[PDB]
Amino acid sequence: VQKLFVDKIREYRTKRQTSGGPVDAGPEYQQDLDRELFKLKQMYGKADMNTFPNFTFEDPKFEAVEKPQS
Amino acid sequence: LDEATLTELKTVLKSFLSKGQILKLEVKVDPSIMGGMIVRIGEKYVDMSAKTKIQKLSRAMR
Numbered sequence A: 001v002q003k004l005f006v007d008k009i010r011e012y013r014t015k016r017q018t019s020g021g022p023v024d025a026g027p028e029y030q031q032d033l034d035r036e037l038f039k040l041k042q043m044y045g046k047a048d049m050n051t052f053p054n055f056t057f058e059d060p061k062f063e064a065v066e067k068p069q070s
Numbered sequence B: 001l002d003e004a005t006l007t008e009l010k011t012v013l014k015s016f017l018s019k020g021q022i023l024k025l026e027v028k029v030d031p032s033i034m035g036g037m038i039v040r041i042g043e044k045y046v047d048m049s050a051k052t053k054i055q056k057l058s059r060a061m062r
Helices: A002-013 A028-042 B050-057
Strands: B037-039 B046-048
Touching: A002 B050, B037 B046
Parallel strands: none
Antiparallel strands: none
């Protein structure tokens, strides 16, 4: 069916004329890609784009031992 | 169809069997097959139709 071989490539080239993502999204693709974009961040964490690690650690304080001896 | 494309298929379907015989046939019209014809010489079923849209699952099958 090479007449069908040409007819699924030629209506693939029409999909390669794109402006803003989906062609017939409407309220469908706008809600779904925003529902999924939250879920990759919801149970994952709150993370910005480029912020480095900012913290500070304190070690164990070295106490002394009192000892009258001999 | 017309006479020039049917009397071939009432004669090119005789070229298969070749055993001194006088062939018979049935016709039934179906539009869900979009663009072809299926034929069944006995239990043979050479299918050429618009099933070939489902065979383009391999494009979506990695």
